[PDB]
Amino acid sequence: QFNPYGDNGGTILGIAGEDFAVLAGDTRNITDYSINSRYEPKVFDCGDNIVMSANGFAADGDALVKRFKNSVKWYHFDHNDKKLSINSAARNIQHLLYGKRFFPYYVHTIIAGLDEDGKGAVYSFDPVGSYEREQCRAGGAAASLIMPFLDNQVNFKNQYEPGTNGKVKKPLKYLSVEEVIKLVRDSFTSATERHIQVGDGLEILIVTKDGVRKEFYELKRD
Amino acid sequence: GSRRYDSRTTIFSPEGRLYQVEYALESISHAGTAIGIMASDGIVLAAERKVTSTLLEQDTSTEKLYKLNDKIAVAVAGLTADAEILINTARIHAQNYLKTYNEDIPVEILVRRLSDIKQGYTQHGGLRPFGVSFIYAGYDDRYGYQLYTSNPSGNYTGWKAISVGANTSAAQTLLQMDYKDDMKVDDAIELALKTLSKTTDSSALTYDRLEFATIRKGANDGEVYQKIFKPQEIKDILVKTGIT
Amino acid sequence: TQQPIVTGTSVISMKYDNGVIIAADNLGSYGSLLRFNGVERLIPVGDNTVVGISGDISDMQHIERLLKDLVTENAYDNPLADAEEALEPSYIFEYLATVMYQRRSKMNPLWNAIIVAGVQSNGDQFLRYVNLLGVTYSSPTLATGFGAHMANPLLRKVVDRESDIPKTTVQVAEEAIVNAMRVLYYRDARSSRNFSLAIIDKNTGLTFKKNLQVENMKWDFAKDIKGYGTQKI
Amino acid sequence: NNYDGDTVTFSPTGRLFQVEYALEAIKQGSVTVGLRSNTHAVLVALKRNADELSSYQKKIIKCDEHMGLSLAGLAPDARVLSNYLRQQCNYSSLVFNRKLAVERAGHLLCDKAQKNTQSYGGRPYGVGLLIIGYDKSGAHLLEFQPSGNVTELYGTAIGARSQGAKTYLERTLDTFIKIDGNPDELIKAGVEAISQSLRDESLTVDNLSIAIVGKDTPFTIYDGEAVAKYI
Amino acid sequence: DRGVSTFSPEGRLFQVEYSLEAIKLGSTAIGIATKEGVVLGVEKRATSPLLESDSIEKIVEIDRHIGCAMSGLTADARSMIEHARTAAVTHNLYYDEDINVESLTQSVCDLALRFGELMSRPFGVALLIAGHDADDGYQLFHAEPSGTFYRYNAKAIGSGSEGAQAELLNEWHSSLTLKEAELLVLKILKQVMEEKLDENNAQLSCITKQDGFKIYDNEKTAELIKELKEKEAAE
Amino acid sequence: GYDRALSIFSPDGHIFQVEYALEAVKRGTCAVGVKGKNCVVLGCERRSTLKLQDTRITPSKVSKIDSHVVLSFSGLNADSRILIEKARVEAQSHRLTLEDPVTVEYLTRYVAGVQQRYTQSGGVRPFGVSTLIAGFDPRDDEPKLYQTEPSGIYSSWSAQTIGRNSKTVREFLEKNYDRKEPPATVEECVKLTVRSLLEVVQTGAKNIEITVVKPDSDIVALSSEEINQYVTQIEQEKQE
Amino acid sequence: MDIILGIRVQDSVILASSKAVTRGISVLKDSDDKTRQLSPHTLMSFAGEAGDTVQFAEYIQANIQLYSIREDYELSPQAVSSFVRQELAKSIRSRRPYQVNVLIGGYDKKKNKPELYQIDYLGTKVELPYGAHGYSGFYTFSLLDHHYRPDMTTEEGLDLLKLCVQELEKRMPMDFKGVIVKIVDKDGIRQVDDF
Amino acid sequence: TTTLAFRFQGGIIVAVDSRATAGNWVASQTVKKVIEINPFLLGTMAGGAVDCQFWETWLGSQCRLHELREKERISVAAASKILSNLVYQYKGAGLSMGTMICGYTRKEGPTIYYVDSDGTRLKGDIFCVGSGQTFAYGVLDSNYKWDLSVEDALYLGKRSILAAAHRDAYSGGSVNLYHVTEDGWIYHGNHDVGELFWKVKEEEGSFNNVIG
Ligand SMILES: *[C@@](C)(CO)[C@](*)(O)[C@H](CC(C)C)NC(=O)[C@H](Cc1ccccc1)NC(=O)[C@H](CC(C)C)NC(=O)[C@H](CCc1ccccc1)NC(=O)CN1CCOCC1
């Protein structure tokens, strides 16, 4: 019987700073035990300082990104070139996903950018449209590997102040873009080591008020 | 396009009248007179056939009086073909009600639905209205014996005695003169025939130019019987009242 | 919901310095029966694109007709149909990709794996894959079916990343493709010896080679192999 | 007279009066000018107001990053036709990953307007459009009429007193066509062209509406203080 | 007869032009836009003294940040308001934000020309749509049955419109306060109204960023009417 | 389907089909609504050119839409049935979804919305009917009286009349009804309603129908003798 | 939903309906009234699939109330039961049938007789002296076969009903949290508050 | 999920956890399971996350349209019935929702309605909904009285979620508290179970099963 879904592997990662946000994703694309491409980008600039990635089944991922990009275009046409805010984009994406509630897009979607106060924002979606704003989110094949590391290093979970008898927590603070990129690179090298569908290359999209910058790093190709 | 040839059958005049309904009523006023008279122990339906020919088969004929179910009948005035369309619908409606509730349809409910169909043709669809006026004679266990009339407008009203078709003005005056509330069926039979006999456009009223029917409780104990009169039975009742 | 009947096996391809090469054997299999032997599975569109198709042949023929009709439709009210407004490989691919995904979404797929090879108007090499699921990807080397498992490893030794493309000539690239076709004939049970090969170069244009054969095969060592373990004769 | 009740009727001389009356709605509309060089294409539009308390009716609409038009006549009809163009441009992008040719855009508008002139019940569009764009064959300018007739031109003008600007552009043809790699000068030529259609009124800051598209310029519209440069 | 969507020889749609005559017969409605808010006022015009004037609803809320006044065949406005409200709420559902006043007006005006041989005739009512958004601030729009809408600093529609508009031309300036605008609507309404203006036959409303759209009480308007009469007698 | 635009604008800005529907209302028998301090009374004329009528079964002029709301009308009788039916269906639908009976304003707004829809829908003519809708909102003791008309406009009235010679009875009500002090009791409200109809009717025999609605679904129709007592009382006070 | 009983006596119809609403391993409510008044002298109890039960009951209620207003007249229990049966008979061959079983207890004012109708989700109607739906019948029918007499009073019927509830409380696996008892007679419908 | 809401002398308490799971994978510890429909209406969420989230914010839009059309805030009964009638249309399609519509109006007073995805709609004084509902019931029922003070009622609601958060593997994260009065709903903070458990253990002397 024809199975309309497939698994293209890969993993993605979104972190929000004080005045910036990053959305990272490996460039490996796979089916079963075969590599289809070592450089197939799945993190896209969608305009209005919104970056997006829909990881999982690539056909559904591309379809979604394509539809959201198109939604941004028509938002301009219908509302006098108004900038689509990240919160409005998130709500719009929910309706895109939930529109196919009974034949879902097989993807973990993450978007990143700046909120209307200029602060870093990351939103994450389940396959059928439930969303939540967070400081931190890993998605895709190696999400279960990376996410607990992020809880520990970004949100300082389970870390107490030394000598305080486990009474005072390590205080929350925003990370610099330099520190965030260190965590992203270490997260992906660790994921590459222990997950077979993750590797080849890492592509990070950084979002500030100045625009969308890109950075690329090699990953192990085995 | 086709706009050019549209008569616009469902519009108002400047005076607030429906042209086609008014002209349908004008048509009905040339149809053979039909009279309904409601007594305390039954209902009489009497109707005059439209200028009969001597070679017309009289006994196997039905023009004016139709049966809707065992408890309800109608007298027709207007286009017979139009009436039969509505009669079959009314017959089906009665059976739908019986099938749904396991009870014979109350007279007014049937009358309202048939009148609602007529109304529809005056408000939407762009079709001509039905050129028909009915006299409904029937019985149910709520209101007992009932007479109604409906016309092309889809408006219906209840009556003790009523006429439709030709010479209703003269016929209604004569009924209003001799009718009284404690009247019996046999008296109503006589009134119906006497009224037609005076209002007729013919030279003399005869059996071959009439249709007649009664709805009595004259069956055996607490049940209603419909009697559509045969030619010979009309001949006898016409002699019995001294018209011929 | 379908099942493929008459099928075509691997389509293999790679980029080189001035263009792209694509190849596919001329077999139309009917399960284990090697039914049809004159099947052309490389279909040129214009003078700048070749679409290689594997999978169901009835659906391949349907796709042929769509591409044929696309050329006709593009020519309508188009004075620049053979110039600036000619069909690009990227246009042809995106059209097919749209159709493939629409058909999978209606639960009635075209049971194919497709590789669109060509050269864009600006000279850039175009090589992209699409299949029955509407999944798309691009790479310096692309292959379908058994080609993905056996050809890609061999072709990736020549062009392992983007920077290896300018260093790879058409002679070296074609040699690797022809070698890969031999390996597939050794190891794929639904492959044939006869195949077609197409080169799309930004200078010399479209070169379509028909009736090629696998050759220079190693079979002599078979005579020494006796039994399955012990046996000496 | 007797043959103008609807679009489906021909006159005895072979005229379609409803189409001609729709054409008349354009003549009443405010003037708008179109012109192009080899590198850029420019729209200039005189906006009209109801009174001093009202805003000035926006004449120019964007269809894609590389295409857009100006209107003269019934504005709602322009909105319908522009929306249709937006969809067609967008269909070309999503399906073929291909920017819609400005010539095809004209063919599509022609065929959409035509269907409304041959069927009972419908009416012709009551608006004229000047479509500019930059595609794979360079800069373009089209003139759309609701009869269905679309015409590719170097320059033109539609609306009330459009003959003045149209005569000017016919004289200036050899000059403005060679304004290559210079946006501001091509606009100046368009602003001077539309000035030939003015009577009693002059070009003010909230009156003038300019748009441009070209080689390294997406379709963008200029209003308000952004057009003060050209007065 | 003749087609509903027919052009006149002058290049206008007959039915649209005839609907504009119906709007001229309607009761007066005035809107004034300021930097402190937008004021909307209407003439109620009760046909008889037995009619309970507070049931005359010619000023209407579309959303918290958008209000609407009407003039003409006011029964035709009901489906327009219903569409506007649904448009406003639907946009909030899809985008988690308030909808722009212009976009709302454009959505309403898209219904206008959806008539022919869709509904059987154009609307016989004009609307004044007042509101606020973060981008373009306080706005007033005049939505016609032609499908056209103009933004206005001030606008009058209905029977006394041409006289009231000429008055608004002289009186309006860019530095008007909200209180000044309130009195100005009352002043101009009292001029063009047939019967004498009071709190029962005239209604005020406004939309501000802080408090949103509010229809004024008859007690609040009565004090503004009294304040207006005193100021005119004071010079 | 039949598509013709029957209701359309004329050069002077009038919709003649809607205005001709008002003429049908003007032809219809007179109907009056008067609301007191704790009640509403709906009075209706019945023309006396129809003798030999059966008043048991003849459709009554005042119709119950729900147990707490009533609807009378003037104009085409057949048209009124369609509006009444729709109103009754909407009343039950409202109870089903909102778990609360309709307000009189809501029910009026619905009926008025139906009438309006028929003034700009293709293939249909307007209803030749104006209605008076009266009752009490759930758990409320404030009397409600509303009027609708073919165009689709509706409004609340302290007292109102529609139909033939309605301008005469409206003239009467305008001077005899005090806003500051409405009829304090049921008797006062009925009497004022009967008085107003006696300006127009002819005889106070079987020509006047009176229906009294009180709070908490308390609706009752008066009989001939009960109404005749008001007619007898009014005439004796008149001779003065 | 689970237990609905009905007993027709000399001058009235008595309906008893369990108060428990259970979902999974939790009794969510113990005061649920599994009945709707269709008309002043007609009461319908119901049991079956969650959601369907109330949705169906209220849909029937609306229709009967609509009829009552239109005709200014109360439909007979027989007429109501026939209407309900037909709706279920339509439903069973729908895309998604109403999985609802009902008892209709009514007092016919024209006949001056109480009437009890049992109708299952298939549209199977029967008039009975006593009725039950679900597993209740397996205990109550035999009990009533023994103790029921056609000429009993309302008070005798309530004692007979107590005997059923006691037996069910003894032998039924599930805790149904007692019953709400309602009486339908010539004076209309009233609830017994202490049972 | 674990959610509860109970009616008492001083109005309505509403308490929920904040965990979201995909099988045994803890997907989030910071989910908002209370939807603020208007200043007088709350909705709780349990079951399929987007099913709840989507349709309850849709419910808020419908409630807004009601007060625009009717010039009056919607009743709790009518608001709950819009949702129950909606999910009933989808019955059999596979929606997964266990919701509670809580609020105050003049005509009704404080009111709670349980509404679930198979079409069940129930008015009541106490409900617990979710995978850890039974754990919440155990503590809530055994300590519930109508005459609880606002302070004690808030704590009992908090303590009941904590009880479920502890025992139920698919509940946890933090406790969100709400108090509904005649003046509307009042938020009473986010309480992380990480700190709350030890604080409650020490101060109350409970949770003796755990290694102190
Ligand atoms: C308690 C915590 C447990 O039930 C509560 O009931 C909460 C309710 C809150 C969040 C409103 N329920 C859940 O967390 C709920 C449990 C559940 C899961 C599936 C069906 C019913 C109930 N979890 C979800 O809904 C999660 C939401 C978070 C963001 C992950 N979603 C999923 O599990 C999704 C969508 C499930 C689904 C529902 C209906 C149709 C299609 C799909 N599924 C995945 O993300 C799949 N999975 C993620 C891991 O990577 C492999 C793919």
CA distance to B102, E40, G63, G85, G118, per residue, from G123 (Å): 15, 60, 18, 5, 10
Chain H residues in contact with E91 by the CB 8 A cut-off are: none
CA distance to B87, B223, F113, G37, H39, per residue, from F96 (Å): 36, 41, 21, 14, 26
Which residues make Cβ contacts (< 8 Å) with residue B224, sequence separation at least 6?
B70, B71, B139, B215, B216, B217
What is the interface size between E and H, counted as CB pairs within 8 Å?
Answer: 16
Q: Report which DSSP code applies to A169.
A: B
Closest CB from D94, D101, D107 relative to C85: D101
Can you tell me the distance from the alpha carbon of C53 to that of C194, in angstroms, rounded to the nearest whole number?
Answer: 16
Interface contact B8, partner G, CB < 8 A: no
Can you tell me the distance from the alpha carbon of F104 to that of F40, in angstroms, rounded to the nearest whole number?
Answer: 12
| Distance (Å) from CA H13 to ligand 1 centroid | 26
Can you tell me the distance from the alpha carbon of H194 to that of A211, in angstroms, rounded to the nearest whole number?
Answer: 39
Interface contact E90, partner A, CB < 8 A: no
CB contact under 8 Å between D137 and C90, yes or no, is: no
Domain residue spans in chain G? 1-195
E strands, F10-65, where?
31-35, 40-45, 63-64
Interface contact B17, partner F, CB < 8 A: yes
Interface contact B149, partner F, CB < 8 A: no
CB G157 within 8 A of CB G105: no
Which residues make Cβ contacts (< 8 Å) with residue E154, sequence separation at least 6?
D53, E30, E31, E32, E33, E140, E168, E171, E172
Q: A105-142 b/e with 16+ CB inside 10 Å = b?
A: bbbbbbbbbbeeeeebbbbbbbbbbbbbebbbbbbbbb
- Note the resolution in Å, 1 decimal: 2.6
CB contact under 8 Å between A85 and E102, yes or no, is: no
Nearest chain D residue (CA) to C93? D96
CA atoms within 13 A on the CB side of F201: 21
The domain spanning residue F57 has which CATH number?
3.60.20.10
Measure B161 CA to nearest chain G CA, in Å.
24
Measure C156 CA to nearest chain A CA, in Å.
11
Q: Reply yes or no on whether C1 is catalytic.
A: yes
Q: Report which DSSP code applies to C222.
A: G
Q: Give CATH for domain G1-195.
A: 3.60.20.10
Can you tell me the distance from the alpha carbon of D62 to that of D74, in angstroms, rounded to the nearest whole number?
Answer: 17
CB B228 within 8 A of CB B65: yes
CB atoms within 10 A of CB C193: 16
From its phi and psi, is residue H184 left (phi > 0), alpha (psi between -120 and 50) or beta?
left
R_g over Cα of chain E: 18
Closest CB from G58, G59, G66 relative to F89: G66
First to last CA, chain C: 52
Can you tell me the distance from the alpha carbon of C90 to that of C49, in angstroms, rounded to the nearest whole number?
Answer: 9
Measure D192 CA to nearest chain E CA, in Å.
28
The domain spanning residue D177 has which CATH number?
3.60.20.10
Chain F residues in contact with B11 by the CB 8 A cut-off are: 6, 17, 125
Chain G residues in contact with B106 by the CB 8 A cut-off are: 71
Domain residue spans in chain H? 1-212
Q: Check the annotation: does H169 bind a ligand.
A: no
Structure-determination technique: X-ray
Burial class (CB in 10 A: 0-12, 13-18, 19+), F66: buried
3-state secondary structure F214-230: ECCCEEEECCHHHHHHH
Can you tell me the distance from the alpha carbon of A69 to that of A84, in angstroms, rounded to the nearest whole number?
Answer: 11
Residue of E74, E75, E78, E103 whose CA lies nearest to E88: E103
CB contact under 8 Å between G50 and H121, yes or no, is: no
Single-letter amino acid, residue E168: L
Measure E191 CA to nearest chain A CA, in Å.
38
SS3 H39: coil
Can you tell me the distance from the alpha carbon of B156 to that of B133, in angstroms, rounded to the nearest whole number?
Answer: 10
- The total number of structural domains that make up chain D: 1
- The total number of structural domains that make up chain C: 1
Which residues make Cβ contacts (< 8 Å) with residue A177, sequence separation at least 6?
A17, A20, A22, A206
| Parallel/antiparallel/unpaired status of strands C49-56 and C112-119 | antiparallel
Interface contact H111, partner F, CB < 8 A: no
CB contact under 8 Å between H122 and G21, yes or no, is: yes
Q: Which of D94, D99, D220 to mutate to test the interface with A (most CBs of A within 10 A)?
A: D94
Enclosing domain of residue C223:
1-233
Which residues make Cβ contacts (< 8 Å) with residue G116, sequence separation at least 6?
G6, G7, G8, G13, G103, G104, G105, G106, G127, G128, G129, G130, G131
Helix axis angle, H193-204 to H150-167, nearest 10°: 110
Q: How far is CA E205 from the centre of its chain?
A: 10
Residue of A144, E26, F114, C212 whose CA lies nearest to H26: A144
- The total number of structural domains that make up chain A: 1
Q: G141-171 b/e with 16+ CB inside 10 Å = b?
A: bebbeeebeeebebebbbebbeebbeebeee
Single-letter amino acid, residue B220: N
| Distance (Å) from CA A137 to ligand 1 centroid | 16
Of C1, C168, C204, C230, which residue is the catalytic one?
C1
Q: At the topology level of CATH, where does H1-212 sit?
A: Glutamine Phosphoribosylpyrophosphate, subunit 1, domain 1 (3.60.20)
Closest CB from C85, C93, C94 relative to D137: C85
Helix axis angle, D162-176 to D183-194, nearest 10°: 150
In DSSP terms, H21 is beta-bridged to: H26
Which residues make Cβ contacts (< 8 Å) with residue G58, sequence separation at least 6?
F96, G36
Interface of D with A in 122-161 (CB under 8 A): none
CB contact under 8 Å between F13 and E75, yes or no, is: no
Measure H193 CA to nearest chain A CA, in Å.
13
The domain spanning residue C22 has which CATH number?
3.60.20.10
Interface contact D111, partner C, CB < 8 A: no
Q: Report which DSSP code applies to D146.
A: T
Name chain A's partners: 3 or more CB pairs within 8 A.
Answer: C, D, E, H
Residue of B200, B149, B129 whose CA lies nearest to B37: B149
Chain B residues in contact with G110 by the CB 8 A cut-off are: 141
Chain C residues in contact with D96 by the CB 8 A cut-off are: 91, 94-95
What is the interface size between A and H, counted as CB pairs within 8 Å?
Answer: 30
CB atoms within 10 A of CB C70: 18
| Distance (Å) from CA F81 to ligand 1 centroid | 53
* Residue A153, phi then psi, degrees to nearest 5: -95, -30
Chain A residues in contact with C161 by the CB 8 A cut-off are: 38-39
Closest CB from H27, H30, H54 relative to A94: H54
CA distance to D143, D167, D195, per residue, from D173 (Å): 17, 10, 16
CB contact under 8 Å between D76 and E150, yes or no, is: no
Measure D164 CA to nearest chain A CA, in Å.
33
CB contact under 8 Å between E85 and H57, yes or no, is: no
| Parallel/antiparallel/unpaired status of strands B65-67 and B72-78 | antiparallel
Q: Which of the listed residues H4, H21, H128 should we mutate to test ligand 1's pocket, taking the one with most ligand atoms within 8 A of CB? A: H21
CATH assignment of B1-244, among 3.40.50.880, 3.60.20.10, 3.90.1150.10, 2.60.120.260? 3.60.20.10
CB contact under 8 Å between A130 and H93, yes or no, is: no
Enclosing domain of residue A133:
1-222
3-state helix, strand, coil in chain G (%, to 5): 35, 35, 30
Q: Structure tokens of E168? A: 């608004």
Can you tell me the distance from the alpha carbon of F121 to that of G183, in angstroms, rounded to the nearest whole number?
Answer: 51
Closest CB from E61, E62, E93 relative to H61: E93
CB contact under 8 Å between G28 and H124, yes or no, is: yes
Q: At the topology level of CATH, where does E1-235 sit?
A: Glutamine Phosphoribosylpyrophosphate, subunit 1, domain 1 (3.60.20)
Can you tell me the distance from the alpha carbon of C75 to that of E235, in angstroms, rounded to the nearest whole number?
Answer: 80
SS3 A9: coil
Nearest residue by C-alpha to atom 8 in ligand 1: H46
The C-alpha angle C15, C18, C19, rounded to 5 degrees, equals 45
Can you tell me the distance from the alpha carbon of H122 to that of H100, in angstroms, rounded to the nearest whole number?
Answer: 9
Nearest residue by C-alpha to atom 14 in ligand 1: H20
Residue of A52, A61, A212 whose CA lies nearest to C137: A61
Closest CB from A126, A134, A144 relative to H49: A126
Q: Structure tokens of H78? A: 């009518």
Nearest residue by C-alpha to atom 15 in ligand 1: H48
CB contact under 8 Å between C91 and D96, yes or no, is: yes
Can you tell me the distance from the alpha carbon of B12 to that of B32, in angstroms, rounded to the nearest whole number?
Answer: 29
What sections of chain E are H helices per DSSP? 14-25, 77-95, 101-112, 161-171, 178-192, 218-233
From its phi and psi, is residue H47 left (phi > 0), alpha (psi between -120 and 50) or beta?
left
Interface contact B99, partner G, CB < 8 A: yes
The C-alpha angle D221, D223, D224, rounded to 5 degrees, equals 160
Which residues surround ligand 1 with Cβ inside 6 Å?
A: A 104, 126-128, 130; H 1, 19-22, 27, 31, 33, 45-49, 52, 96, 130-131, 170-171
